[PDB]
Ligand SMILES: *[C@@H]1O[C@H](CO)[C@@H](O[C@@H]2O[C@H](CO)[C@@H](O[C@@H]3O[C@H](CO)[C@@H](O)[C@H](O)[C@@H]3O)[C@H](O)[C@H]2NC(C)=O)[C@H](O)[C@H]1NC(C)=O
Ligand SMILES: *[C@@H]1O[C@H](CO)[C@@H](O[C@@H]2O[C@H](CO)[C@@H](O)[C@H](O)[C@H]2NC(C)=O)[C@H](O)[C@H]1NC(C)=O
Ligand SMILES: *[C@@H]1O[C@H](CO)[C@@H](O)[C@H](O)[C@H]1NC(C)=O
């Protein structure tokens with residue numbers, strides 16, 4: 001509805017910090033599924 | 036560059052999000068990895 | 071005391087930090103003052119001279 005708007009990506013101060021634990025939790029799942 | 040700065044710690048609201056859950060998940064992980 | 075001595079009891083406050091209030095009221099964040107603290111003194115001192 002607003003005119004003059006543009007596309008870009010809004011950075012999230014939560015997901016990469018949360019994905020850092022996803023980097024730990026999912027790795028822990030792979031740390032237990034594979035053996 | 037800032038003059039007069041002093042050392043201290045800042046308590047993130049995300050800190051309890053990882054304190055009360057990740058250890059709980061680690062408790063679940065120990066509930067899962069140990070057996 | 072900044073400007074609080076006009077409204078009630080005078081309250082002491084460092085001058086190097088008072089400009090953060092004045093800059094905040096202008097519409098400029100406080101971070102520009104401390105990061106330019108050395109420079110902003112030279113402009114003020116030269117101007118008053
Ligand atoms: C706040 O804490 C930080 C770190 O927790 C302090 O920074 C550290 O300050 C010490 C000085 O006591 C620095 O040691 C110096 O190391 C250089 C070599 O890099 C050496 O030539 C000096 O003689 C001295 O030993 C230390 O490097 C520095 N840390 C870092 C990462 O640079 C800071 O001083 C603390 N500030 C206050 C007000 O408590
Ligand atoms: C901003 O991006 C969106 C999607 O990336 C664009 O929406 C698409 O616009 C095209 C027209 O060229 C449509 O055919 C698509 O159906 C639209 N996508 C969706 C999901 O509806 C939008 O046009 C872009 N806007 C600007 C100003 O670049
Ligand atoms: C994977 O699980 C084991 C438990 O058997 C643990 O000792 C190890 O630290 C885990 N891996 C990582 C990267 O933490």
Ligand SMILES: *[C@@H]1O[C@H](CO)[C@@H](O)[C@H](O)[C@H]1NC(C)=O
Nearest residue numbers: 059062063064065066067070
């Ligand atoms: C441990 O896991 C089992 C099944 O996975 C569950 O029944 C039990 O409640 C869990 N223990 C704790 C303390 O969560």
